[PDB]
Amino acid sequence: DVVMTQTPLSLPVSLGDQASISCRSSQSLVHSNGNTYLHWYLQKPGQSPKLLIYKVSNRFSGVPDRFSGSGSGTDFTLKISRVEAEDLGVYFCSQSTHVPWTFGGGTKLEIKRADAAPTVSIFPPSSEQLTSGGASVVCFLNNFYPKDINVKWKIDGSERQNGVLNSWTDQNSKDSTYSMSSTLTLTKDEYERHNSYTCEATHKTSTSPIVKSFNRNEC
Amino acid sequence: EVKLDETGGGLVQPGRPMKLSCVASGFTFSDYWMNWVRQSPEKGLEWVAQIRNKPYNYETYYSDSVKGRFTISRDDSKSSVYLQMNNLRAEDMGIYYCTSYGYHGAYWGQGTLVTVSAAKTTAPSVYPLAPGTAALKSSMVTLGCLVKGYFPEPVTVTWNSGSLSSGVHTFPAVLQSALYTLTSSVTVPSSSWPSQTVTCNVAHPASSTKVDKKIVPRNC
Numbered sequence: 001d002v003v004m005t006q007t008p009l010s011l012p013v014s015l016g017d018q019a020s021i022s023c024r025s026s027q028s029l030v031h032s033n034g035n036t037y038l039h040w041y042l043q044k045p046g047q048s049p050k051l052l053i054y055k056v057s058n059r060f061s062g063v064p065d066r067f068s069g070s071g072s073g074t075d076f077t078l079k080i081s082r083v084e085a086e087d088l089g090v091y092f093c094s095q096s097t098h099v100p101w102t103f104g105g106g107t108k109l110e111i112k113r114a115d116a117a118p119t120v121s122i123f124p125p126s127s128e129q130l131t132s133g134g135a136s137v138v139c140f141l142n143n144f145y146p147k148d149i150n151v152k153w154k155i156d157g158s159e160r161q162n163g164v165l166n167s168w169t170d171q172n173s174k175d176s177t178y179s180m181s182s183t184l185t186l187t188k189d190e191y192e193r194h195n196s197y198t199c200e201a202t203h204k205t206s207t208s209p210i211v212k213s214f215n216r217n218e219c
Numbered sequence: 220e221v222k223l224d225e226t227g228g229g230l231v232q233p234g235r236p237m238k239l240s241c242v243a244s245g246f247t248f249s250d251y252w253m254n255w256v257r258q259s260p261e262k263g264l265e266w267v268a269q270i271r272n273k274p275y276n277y278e279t280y281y282s283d284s285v286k287g288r289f290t291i292s293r294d295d296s297k298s299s300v301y302l303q304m305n306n307l308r309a310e311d312m313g314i315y316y317c318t319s320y321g322y323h324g325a326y327w328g329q330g331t332l333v334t335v336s337a338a339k340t341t342a343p344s345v346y347p348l349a350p351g352t353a354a355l356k357s358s359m360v361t362l363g364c365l366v367k368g369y370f371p372e373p374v375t376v377t378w379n380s381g382s383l384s385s386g387v388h389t390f391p392a393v394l395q396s397a398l399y400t401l402t403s404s405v406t407v408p409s410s411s412w413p414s415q416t417v418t419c420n421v422a423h424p425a426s427s428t429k430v431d432k433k434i435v436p437r438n439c
């Protein structure tokens with residue numbers, strides 16, 4: 001199997017910036033018929049891979065003039081003249097000169113933007129979940145930046161360390177922020193053994209934590 | 220408009236078989252080599268099989284991982300390719316994409332998730348997420364929808380039959396106790412809610428579930 005190596009793994013850049021992704025093969029990609037079967041793809045969050053550059057340097061139909069492919073032999077590079085927010089996602093190269101066809105491990109393009117604090121919302125269990133005898137406490141931390149954030153749940157001033165599920169979205173294609181969901185799943189017996197439920201976040205945009213809470217009885 | 224429509228994905232017990240299909244339209248099918256590629260968080264993107272066109276006798280190739288277990292075939296009369304998979308293992312799990320490779324370009328289908336597990340199909344439990352005290356965050360309001368304990372993926376979530384697009388966040392599903400749980404938020408202009416009705420619609424093909432929950436105000 002020919003090995004494809006992609007560098008870097010992550011590439012943060014600002015709108016307008018130029019970006020360079022490199023891809024190397026363990027063996028020559030020049031086919032005995034004389035073509036070099038090296039292609040570049042972009043996979044946007046949630047979508048399937050889309051071809052950008054075919055055979056080292058041919059810009060595919062409908063691809064912006066700001067993407068160019070270059071290289072030969074075993075070193076190829078993909079250049080993006082001026083990064084736009086919609087270029088966000090993972091770029092892959094592949095070789096199809098040899099069977100098996102193989103892909104690089106991908107390079108994630110991240111867009112650097114101005115810090116933005118989390119818009120926090122806390123949600124207590126709906127009557128319907130309580131009837132099934134379940135109590136899930138949901139907290140949304142929407143549109144922040146950078147990705148690095150920390151959430152903690154406090155039940156009656158104490159720190160809960162069991163029953164929390166966290167999920168992060170990929171970076172947004174439109175405004176380049178991140179969101180995150182944090183769910184505290186308790187049985188209803190568990191949920192009525194306490195009163196204060198607190199969603200607490202730590203983002204470098206504020207020195208003090210962003211706190212959102214609600215009390216069961218206070219409800 | 221080209222499209223590669225792949226179908227036949229879903230949940231299947233290890234050791235059992237599965238058959239995927241791909242229908243192509245919008246380009247000259249006989250001028251292309253068809254390939255199935257799969258993607259999984261573990262190994263990332265991996266090529267699995269290929270079937271060439273007429274000029275090359277419909278020759279087929281496979282990766283060592285599936286040789287002997289997978290068979291690929293095509294029918295130029297129906298613009299279709301098929302992937303017959305037998306004795307599936309955990310390592311075969313992933314999103315399978317139908318692809319067509321040609322002289323001037325290449326296209327990829329949308330992908331179909333194949334889940335190889337012994338677990339049984341579990342319908343999701345859908346619950347609305349209304350504010351503790353619905354007023355105004357700024358010029359907006361965040362509402363939600365919890366899709367609890369289902370199996371397997373995927374689950375489709377839309378807001379207002381689809382009419383509400385901007386301001387929607389659907390988080391990746393997370394595996395808890397052998398089950399998936401997922402949420403979706405949507406932010407709407409304050410004057411809009413609770414004035415007009417907002418509802419999440421959830422669809423879980425595997426269990427043939429289709430739920431529509433309206434998001435109502437809740438002081439509690």
Ligand SMILES: O=C(O)c1ccccc1-c1c2ccc(=O)cc-2oc2cc(O)ccc12
Pocket residue numbers: 031033035037096097250251252320321322
């Ligand atoms: O490059 C070609 O001549 C070609 C033309 C029509 C259909 C397939 C191919 C094609 C190949 C044809 C002959 C060959 O020996 C190797 C080929 O590799 C290809 C690799 C691709 O990614 C994409 C396409 C090919």
